[PDB]
Write a protein that binds this DNA or RNA. Structure first.
Ligand SMILES: [Ca+2]
Ligand SMILES: [Ca+2]
Ligand SMILES: [Ca+2]
Ligand SMILES: [Ca+2]
Ligand SMILES: [Zn+2]
Ligand SMILES: [Zn+2]
Lengths: 351, 615, 614, 351
DNA sequence: CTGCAGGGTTTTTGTTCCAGTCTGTAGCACTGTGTAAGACAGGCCAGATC
DNA sequence: GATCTGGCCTGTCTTACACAGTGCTACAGACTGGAACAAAAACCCTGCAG
């Protein structure tokens, strides 16, 4: 559990406080850049390199049958496990656009071929969704499950503006959480179904969740309605029966009062939280290991790496995990004149 | 005995009443018995007739101008206006007020309370109205005032922060404010048209141009944009075959005094996120506005109003950045046709207008799906460089000012290369180029008496594109053939400079428009003949535009200098002058005040008082 | 039947007289009975009273101003006066004036050209005079005006760089302009004293206070130096047989509104060379004027004048500078006593005042030649900190504002100190003092409603002296002895503080002055005992002066505060605002203007015409 | 014969253009300091050490029987060669007072004891003047002669403020050439006598003259009466006849138009003249050298060392020889903000 | 006839209250929260030689 | 090689140096009515002062 400050050489403006990372077979690609692409990188996705404390970026290309994708901001991300029919997809939906609008669209990401020289070819297939489709929303959550042995993917959460009827020129940035309703989706075909639960008293957003072996745990976030960060846990036992995938759930004693954290994987279901936000003004700052088992979820405090006084005194902080128990974060840089590198950069690890 | 009784006018008003009580109650009872108890009118007529009995006609007429005639100096209006018309702060105004009150009694000016309230007569949100049909997705509240651009931007640090400080008015409200301002001249244009007024209360036609352009050098973050707009003209569509008679037409649109700001935000011009995040509601109301009919008590008569808009007031950079095209120097330069780079050099005169906002949407859709499963550059070419999603409709038109600026800088470096011999030396060196720069600088310092600048202003441009500057620098280029070449070049250029610089070319230089085709073709062919040295396949976008687009656009619309956006640039100077003098200063109030002041600055209802009684 | 009664004010004057003839006869006969036939004034007064019954004062004032004379236009004097009194550009004034002239003009304001002449009788270089004896090495020309401070400086590149732009007047001309301005009021005071106005008109006496401070942040700050003077109090000895009679002592000399600037230079306050190169001629001509007498036509009579000059309006470090004292925390602490810093702990009151200008010159020469072959620091000792040939003589006294600011920051510091611990933790570290100041300002904020400041401000010190902030903070003290002790110290301070703040304690409040020695003794020994840990042998200089010299200087030189450079510092705001928005951006002329404009700002002529009956 | 960009570690604010650099007994000593002497060093003079383009300034201390000297700004300097009965002296007179005044006072400076620990004791004596004394002047030029065989001192040149009668407060900063009288002084006794010269048209300044074996050679300088710079040097010979020091002059027609140049003595009487100002703007950029003789001037322009654009662009400059074909020059610097070392420094050497 | 104190006189001038109102002047949030020079104390230390 | 020491370094102290003028707001002061009341300003009017 160590942190090291980094300094990116030739990249200092493209990332924004809300962005994303995606790993395919150990290969890291940044997703979500500030604004539309220039003439430089018409894809906006960057293969990332962290070597001798230096941070480099390189541009990616795609196939021709692969449609291109605008830079979403805070969508739900889901690694589709490599299996039939098409390994190895990685799901993207649906976030908000550079133009402050929402996508409400499903993209599947995949690798195609390589190289030649460390070059990797990728692809994006927009798949239409049939329903009973979900509405446009962002900051939501979605994960995959298997039911003997069918494969489905379920979404819930997210914020959105007021409905267009009351959409008001003075409320045009006012937003509320989505209704407390999940949406089950088969990937083939693009079916979508909406479902509410009696225990599901209220919608939410920002929340992270982990699925495994037909059951999911919905973990802590924050609800804007009551302005509360309820530290309970949600846990839904779901299954796919022909043709009604019935779904039950329960509330455990305690989850955690955290908001929009950085979750790294280390094992199958041994994961770790690098801190999100406990209070609206006060950041939670320590780690927390969480395993999930068929017996249940098992969580324990850990030793937090020795934070820099600066990262201790940032007002904001964010990022994702480089993977396998390693993460990367950035801090808004304070200086007049600006560096103008708007962020210090740190690299954290465990053990 | 008795104390000597003094002159009634010199006694104390307490003692004056103590001694006058008798006739006081007498006049009281006379008013009550004969004139309905109106003592005021009774004593007014008493003094009036007593004065007019002594041949005091002048003082009686001045008194009659005082009673039932608003004397008391001149007016609240001109008072507040003059306060604006010289940027005087409030404490200063009151200091002058009390002064001119004490010395030279009979105060002329108004105190602070009178003008504070008088504001709300010309502030936005004062005249009532409504829409038919009702305005969609818009609150019908009509008495609102200033709103920070957050539009309910939730401040959740978990989400994107509310770190941006902004103010704005409600679009319709400033619109109706400007119209109610110009109800005066609309009634006067109805007069000049000898036109009915009880009738023709439905077919009014109003057109507005707009603009938005940030600026740096605001400190001691750092940048802000001043989104503004101004009415251009208004005509009559009723009742048939008559297409339209210009009832009002603007005379000085490029002028600052016609530039109505609407919203300001402490943001850079670059980051497309905050700009959209703020201006969104403006776009929604804009598009929701084309349809409904507005009801206004114009000339006391409730009449309807409809609106057409033409987005013009944007620099090339912003024009693109709200059109999602390649910014800036890619193979697609014509923001109207689909020319390549070298094709605009291949043929420099035969281009049409194709780039249409709706087709921009349609082809961004093709980019989005790629229904033909094509490669990156393959689909980019098939789509003709439609790279991003469009965001807002602008009329595919040109800015005269920065096109002139491009002509200026291009001829500037032409001179810098003609002092040296680039047609002999195709690859001269950087330091020799800087020496040619400095000798051109000293040459135009001696003749034409001009100093160097690192970046150019408009006067630099105009004073540069002159045949006198040509013949002044031509003394340095030795080849008398290249001299005559670029001499005829500048000649044919000026043969058309007013064509785009004309406010009404249909009248101001119609023959200059007629031969424009031949002049521009001569220009391009002269390039290909003697100046192809530089224009093999590389050109500047502005030239491209001034060659193959001027007559088309102007014939389709009427002018260019009419839709020119110039004002905002020098108005940034005014914005700075306002801020550093009248600020509170507090961030939540800086704009919240400067916007008021600024909007006030541009009411004809005031500016006439500067020019109305002056000629 | 009959004709209906309409409104009386709408029918013709025939019907008005018809319906009012009875009351017209009533008012006519009443005026004839009581005032002797004054119909006009009686109907006027009744109409005005009826208007005022409804509290309509405005229209009554309007109509009365229309009568008994008028105020149609304006005098040009108050016009230009107002213009300068609110810092407007000529462009502005013209736009506004043309505007209003277009509207109900009846041109009231006046155009520019007449103003720009109406002041050459107010600007210097205009009033004829002469002297007896002649001024040594001084042009007798009474007409000259704005002069670049270069003093005919040889532009020779090879020699010293002749770089700084400066402006100033000829000291004499500014003085005579100030006089010719105050002349109305000196005559007024003559009448008040009822002394003859024809004779006894050659032996007046004018007190001059000189002053000069630097000023940064004038855009690198550009750190330009401001120099001003002011008439303080004019007295008269004629025809002798007496001491002198103060005709006009200024009432509010503290106010910058009576502080006229004389010289402006675009140079730092520390670099001595250029400072001297532009100041020398002025001090020289002042020394020259000290002897001769001035002749001026004042009150229509050719009266005469002599002067006396007080070098007070200066900061400490500058005094030390043009005196040659080793700035600043030297071993020689006081400008006015020669004590060591260390010895100023043993004794703190018994100290004499001997440091005088020519004496310091003599001591500097005795340094230079060293007629005793004594050692280096030995020479330093015997000379008592005299090693730098001074040129500018000054009155040996301190400024009120600076004593106040320094004692205020001393208070603030010791409060931060004893909120933490000193005599129970002897050596505190830096972060300790930091946190103590943080929590100190927290206390000063939660109540007493003060926001923190990087540096000591004046009103900030005023509130920093209130005992209520002391009752608020000292609650944080653990001690009771020391707590009520610092309360009692604040008490003594409040009791004896307005003594130097006073304009004239001998007339304002002689009481504390009588017991000033005693309370100063009390407070000095209270500090020596209860706070020896902090003032073992190191003493802030201003505290030395206020605890060892205040009563003597008060006794000698009339009063104190009456000579503080405070008004000088205030003028910076002016010079700030002036440089902001009344100039073309050209240096050779920026001062050439700012002077003119500012010199206007101080005129009892103008200021009176500005008050105009409050 | 080349430069080197030095750097003064600290105290880069105590150096106005006009100052003096005296070399005796090895080390060199800077005289003249911006502003009066701080208590940091009362006697103001600083010992100079050059190490690695770095400039160290050590404080100095006098004897007790010595006198104390004001930092005269543009004074007259004289190296009195080592000989009986007190080798080896410098003579400073009469200089410009830092507080803006003049001093006709004459100063004899010498070294007394050293060190032991490298700290060298100095001393100064006010040498009273009797005459026919030289008036207070500055920029004047005085040197020393040994004729048959006794030693005297010759002064000429220098301007002065307007006479104390025409001293106009509005002309106070005017200054013109002093009347052209040569001043012959014995250091003991101070029988300073003046002498006219019917051929010496007028006074002058910055004319860096030189004398060799009681024969003096005044190279042309500046004449403010004319703003002219007549190049030609003027030779003269003084003969200490008893008791009349008879004189002779001669108008050499070929010299050099130079003001306030730097002269490093290389040989016994071999002097390289570094640079100064041949115009109001055109500074003497070219180097110069004269071998001295009974024949007199024997001049060659050595190769001028390369010049950095820095020294090319600055309006003016100044400096002095470090002795031994070596010199130090300074340039009024710029910087945003103030460096505040307002001067960049360059060492220069011969061979 | 003078002198002054004080008898009367009408005529200023304020005098008390409860409701307002029109104004001018006071109070305010508020930027930004360390600098820069020089004196003197002492700590240490190289350099140089004793 | 010892030392010591002249000088350079780091620190702590002390004296100046910036933050005011600004639009907005709230309150206070400044004005309208009836009665009946003291106190004065200065005419005149009387009485006692010679
Ligand atoms: Ca621009
Ligand atoms: Ca631009
Ligand atoms: Ca000061
Ligand atoms: Ca000051
Ligand atoms: Zn085109
Ligand atoms: Zn003292």
């Amino acid at each position: 559990m160590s942190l090291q400050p980094l300094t990116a050489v030739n990249c200092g403006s493209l990332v924004q406080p809300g962005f994303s990372l995606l790993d395919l077979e150990g290969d890291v690609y940044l997703f979500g850049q500030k604004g539309w692409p220039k003439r430089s990188c018409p894809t906006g996705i960057f293969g990332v390199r962290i070597k001798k404390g230096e941070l480099k970026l390189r541009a990616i290309s795609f196939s021709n049958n692969s449609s291109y994708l605008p830079p979403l901001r805070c969508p739900a991300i889901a690694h589709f496990e490599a299996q039939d029919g098409k390994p190895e997809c990685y799901l993207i939906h649906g976030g908000r656009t550079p133009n402050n609008e929402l996508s409400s669209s499903l993209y599947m990401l995949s690798v195609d071929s390589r190289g030649c020289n460390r070059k990797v070819t990728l692809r994006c297939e927009e798949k239409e969704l049939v329903g009973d489709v979900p509405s446009a929303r962002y900051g939501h959550t979605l994960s995959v499950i298997n039911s003997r042995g069918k494969t489905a993917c379920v979404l819930f959460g997210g914020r959105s503006y007021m409905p267009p009827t009351e959409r008001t020129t003075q409320n045009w940035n006012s937003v509320v959480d989505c209704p407390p309703q999940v949406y089950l989706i088969d990937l083939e075909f693009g079916c979508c179904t909406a479902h509410t639960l009696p225990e599901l008293t209220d919608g939410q957003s920002f929340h992270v969740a982990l699925a495994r072996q037909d059951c999911v745990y919905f973990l802590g976030g924050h609800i804007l309605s009551s302005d509360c960060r309820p530290s309970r846990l949600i846990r839904l036992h779901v299954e796919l029966l022909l043709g009604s995938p019935v779904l039950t759930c329960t509330i455990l004693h305690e989850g955690l009062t955290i908001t929009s954290a950085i979750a790294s994987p280390i094992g199958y279901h041994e994961y770790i939280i690098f801190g999100g936000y406990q209070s609206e003004t006060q950041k939670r700052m320590e780690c927390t290991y969480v395993g999930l088992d068929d017996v249940g979820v098992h969580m324990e405090s850990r030793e937090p790496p020795q934070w820099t006084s600066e990262i201790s005194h940032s007002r904001t902080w964010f990022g994702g995990s480089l993977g396998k128990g390693t993460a990367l974060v950035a801090i808004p840089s304070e200086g007049n004149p600006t560096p103008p590198e708007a962020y210090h950069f740190y690299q954290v690890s465990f053990q | 005995g008795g104390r000597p009784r003094q002159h009634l006018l010199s006694l104390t008003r307490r003692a004056q009443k103590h001694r006058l009580r008798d006739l006081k109650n007498q006049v009281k009872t006379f008013a009550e018995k004969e004139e309905g108890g109106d003592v005021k009118s009774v004593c007014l007529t008493l003094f009036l007739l007593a004065l007019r009995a002594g041949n005091e006609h002048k003082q009686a007429d001045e008194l009659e101008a005082m009673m039932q005639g608003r004397g008391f100096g001149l007016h609240p209006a001109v008072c507040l206006a003059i306060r604006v018309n010289t940027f005087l702060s409030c404490s200063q105004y009151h200091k002058m007020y009390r002064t001119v009150k004490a010395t030279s009694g009979r105060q002329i000016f108004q105190p602070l309370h009178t003008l504070r309230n008088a504001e709300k007569e010309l502030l936005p949100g004062f005249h009532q109205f409504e829409w038919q049909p009702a305005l969609k997705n818009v609150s019908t509240s009509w008495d609102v005032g200033i709103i920070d651009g957050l539009s309910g931007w939730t401040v959740s640090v978990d989400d994107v922060p509310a770190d941006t400080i902004s103010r704005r008015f409600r679009y319709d409200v400033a619109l109706v404010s400007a119209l109610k301002d110009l109800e005066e001249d609309i009634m006067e244009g109805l007069r000049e048209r000898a036109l009915d007024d009880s009738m023709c209360t439905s077919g009014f036609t109003v057109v507005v141009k707009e603009s938005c352009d940030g600026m740096g050098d605001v400190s001691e973050p750092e940048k802000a944009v001043r989104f503004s707009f101004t009415i251009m003209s208004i005509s009559i569509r009723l009742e048939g075959e008559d297409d339209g008679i210009t009832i009002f037409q603007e005379q000085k649109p490029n002028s600052e005094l016609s530039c109505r700001p609407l919203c300001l935000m402490f943001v850079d011009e670059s980051d497309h996120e905050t700009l959209t995040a703020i201006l969104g509601p403006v776009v929604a109301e804009r598009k929701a506005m084309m349809e409904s009919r507005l009801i206004i008590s114009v000339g006391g008569l409730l009449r309807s109003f409809r609106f057409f808009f033409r987005g013009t007031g944007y620099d090339e950079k912003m024009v693109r950045e709200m059109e999602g095209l390649e910014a800036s120097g890619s193979t697609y330069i014509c923001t109207l046709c689909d020319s390549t780079r070298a094709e605009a050099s291949q043929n420099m005169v035969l281009h049409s207008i194709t780039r249409s906002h709706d087709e921009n949407l349609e082809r961004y859709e093709i980019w989005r799906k790629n229904p033909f499963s094509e490669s990156a550059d393959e689909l980019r070419d098939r789509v003709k460089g439609v790279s991003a999603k469009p965001f807002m409709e602008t009329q595919p038109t040109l800015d005269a000012l920065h096109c002139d600026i491009g002509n200026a800088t291009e001829f500037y470096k032409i001179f810098q290369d003609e002092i040296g011999e680039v047609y002999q030396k195709p690859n001269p060196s950087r330091e020799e180029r800087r020496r040619w720069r400095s000798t051109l600088d000293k040459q135009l310092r001696k003749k034409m008496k001009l100093k160097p600048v690192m970046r150019m202003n408009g006067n630099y441009a105009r004073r540069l594109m002159t045949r006198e500057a040509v013949e002044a620098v031509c003394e340095l280029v030795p080849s008398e053939e290249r001299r005559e070449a670029l001499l005829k070049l500048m000649d044919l250029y000026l043969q058309m400079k007013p064509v785009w610089r004309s406010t009404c070319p249909s009248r101001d230089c119609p023959d200059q428009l007629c031969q424009y085709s031949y002049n521009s073709q001569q220009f391009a062919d002269l390039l290909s003949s003697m100046f192809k040295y530089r224009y093999d396949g590389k050109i500047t976008n502005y030239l491209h535009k001034t060659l193959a687009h001027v007559p088309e656009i102007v014939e389709r619309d009427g002018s260019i200098g009419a839709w020119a956006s110039e004002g905002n640039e020098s108005g940034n100077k005014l914005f700075r002058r306002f801020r550093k003098m009248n600020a509170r200063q507090s961030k939540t109030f800086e704009l919240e005040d400067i916007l008021k002041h600024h909007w006030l600055y541009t009411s004809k209802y005031l500016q006439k008082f500067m020019e109305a009684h002056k000629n």
